[PDB]
């Protein structure tokens, strides 16, 4: 009733974002008792939603949305538990589409550099499947004039 009634509103920075953000900001300590069985369902879905509204927009909304779904504080447990899930493996382009906006800002920037590097760290083991899966991985190089 917050979000299926957002598909209508056809906006992707206010209505959906207010329908989504308070779920993680408030900690939902009293509504997590009844919604405790959902687990990943309530989670990843909200996770997923916070993507598919801004997945097109990128911009500060995106770096912050990664920040929500990324592995920023402690980035090795996620990869050390799963290699590729049919959910978190979907946020890889999300953060990096934000590259487009911050890579526009500066020629060598935190998001892009850290990313493409760690993407090469994970390239060493099962590169080609992921490098093939993502075309966006291509569109990024052209910045530093190296075709």
């Amino acid at each position: 009733k917050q979000i299926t009634q957002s598909a209508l509103l056809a906006e992707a920075r206010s209505d959906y974002s207010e329908a989504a953000k308070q779920y993680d900001e408030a900690l939902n300590k009293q509504d997590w008792v009844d919604g405790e069985p959902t687990e990943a369902e309530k989670d990843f879905w909200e996770l997923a939603s916070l993507d598919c509204y801004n997945h097109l927009a990128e911009w500060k909304s995106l770096e912050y949305c990664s920040t929500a779904s990324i592995d920023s504080e402690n980035p090795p447990d996620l990869n050390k538990i799963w290699s590729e899930p049919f959910y978190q493996e979907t946020y890889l382009p999300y953060m990096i589409r934000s590259k487009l906006k911050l890579l526009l800002q500066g020629e060598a920037d935190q998001s892009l550099l850290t990313f493409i590097d760690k993407a090469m760290h994970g390239e060493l083991q099962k590169a080609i499947l992921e490098l093939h899966y993502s075309q966006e991985l291509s569109l990024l190089y052209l910045l530093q004039d190296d075709v």
């Binding site: 509103l9 056809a10 906006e11 992707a12 920075r13 206010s14 974002s17 097109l56 927009a57």
Partner: protein, 134 residues
């Protein structure tokens, strides 16, 4: 292009960038057509008749008397003004929407004037449809 599709909020950040960026006399009006369309788009939703129609009707004639001292091209820019006006004269019957005065009802007095409740409560229907009429 973003306007008609009704994407809104991506178009919010865009309307901020264009409002900011283009910085000429035809700019201001160009951005305003966009905010006014967005006005119709959220008038589709409820209570914006009080809110957003005010947010965009505010400057639709302040900096407008001094803008493109014609010159050509005005129809496509003055009409959306007419939209922010019918979208109230036809919606605003009385009361409720006047809830937040100090500045609000004052606006109806002034707009009706060039184009403090009784000059509106007893008269604003011969005022609004005429301001929109011009």
């Amino acid at each position: 292009s973003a306007r008609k599709q009704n994407n809104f909020s991506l178009a919010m950040k865009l309307l901020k960038e264009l409002h900011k960026e283009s910085k000429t006399r035809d700019d201001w009006l160009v951005s305003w057509v966009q905010s006014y369309c967005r006005l119709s788009h959220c008038r589709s939703r409820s209570q914006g008749c009080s809110e957003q129609v005010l947010t965009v009707l505010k400057t639709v004639s302040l900096l407008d008397e001094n803008n493109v001292s014609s010159y050509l091209s005005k129809n496509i820019l003055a009409f959306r003004d007419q939209n922010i006006l019918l979208g109230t004269t036809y919606r605003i019957i009385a009361n409720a929407l006047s809830s937040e005065p100090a500045c609000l009802a004052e606006i109806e007095e002034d707009k009706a004037r060039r184009i403090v409740i009784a000059g509106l409560y007893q008269r604003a229907f011969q005022h609004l449809s005429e301001a929109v009429q011009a």
